[PDB]
Design a binder for this molecule. Sequence first.
Ligand code: GGU
Length: 123
Amino acid sequence: AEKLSPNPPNLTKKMKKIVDAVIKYKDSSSGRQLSEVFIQLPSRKELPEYYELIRKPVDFKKIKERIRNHKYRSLNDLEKDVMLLCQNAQTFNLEGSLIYEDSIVLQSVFTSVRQKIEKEDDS
Ligand SMILES: Nc1nnc(-c2ccccc2O)cc1-c1ccccc1
């Protein structure tokens, strides 16, 4: 595939900062790193069923590659992919499950982290 045009540096920096904070997030009481199940998808071969139900699979490793390769052209584009990761979790897993509910929390963490980074960049 053709190399894409680099984003402006501050935009890439904010993308990387947002995703790093979402990844690093830990439940305040328990210390559990909610992102840990979302770093790396299972194989189409350990879990072929995942790929039958989920049209556009994505994990945090893929999101990080899509930042590096400039596939996202705005924070909106990054947000869409994080929220797609979480939607996919919600599609595949049962309401009430650890994976489903953790994805809902990470949606809120993404929003909060983005908001802090945006507010503190407005100078
Ligand atoms: N049940 C799951 N639901 N979702 C993901 C998942 C992982 C990364 C990104 C999005 C996901 O939706 C993984 C499992 C999973 C993990 C290990 C063995 C089997 C399934």
